[PDB]
Amino acid sequence: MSDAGRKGFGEKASEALKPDSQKSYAEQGKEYITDKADKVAGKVQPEDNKGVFQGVHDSAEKGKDNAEGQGESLADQARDYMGAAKSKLNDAVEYVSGRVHGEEDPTKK
């Protein structure tokens, strides 16, 4: 039998008659897992820590050409330097110094 309900008579009559004797019972149970599970899938991966910056860092693809050769001496670094600075400085301070700002206890020995 067609469940897609091309005319809708199957989606309305079937949903309009729903005795709510199972769904409300099963649904309530699934909604509790389905939701949590849907997340345990995007976090389960322990290497996902790099995936967050994988699609973000891509934005710097333009300024990520520091690999290029030198020319002005101060320009060669301006590319990478500016990056390793704000990046490491922020990722080392903003990320670390910022995360420790809340915890006044020894979290990393």
Give an account of the 3D structure:
The protein has 109 residues and is mainly alpha-helical. The chain has 2 domains: 45 residues, Single alpha-helices involved in coiled-coils or other helix-helix interfaces, CATH 6.10.250; 64 residues, no CATH class. It is 55% helix and 0% strand. It is built from 4 helices and no strands. The longest helix has 27 residues. It is elongated. 0% of the residues are buried.
Report the sheet-strand fraction.
Answer: under 5%
What's the overall geometry?
Answer: elongated
Radius of gyration: 27 Å
Number of domains: 2
Gap between N and C termini:
65 Å
PDB class: cell adhesion
Keywords: aging, proteomics
Assembly: monomeric
Entry title: NMR structure of Hsp12, a protein induced by and required for dietary restriction-induced lifespan extension in yeast.
Quick synopsis:
The chain is mostly helical and 109 residues long. 55% of the residues lie in helices and 0% in strands.
Keyword list:
2 domains; monomer; 109 residues; stress response; elongated; Single alpha-helices involved in coiled-coils or other helix-helix interfaces
Give the topology, please.
Elements: H1 9-16, H2 23-43, H3 51-54, H4 74-100
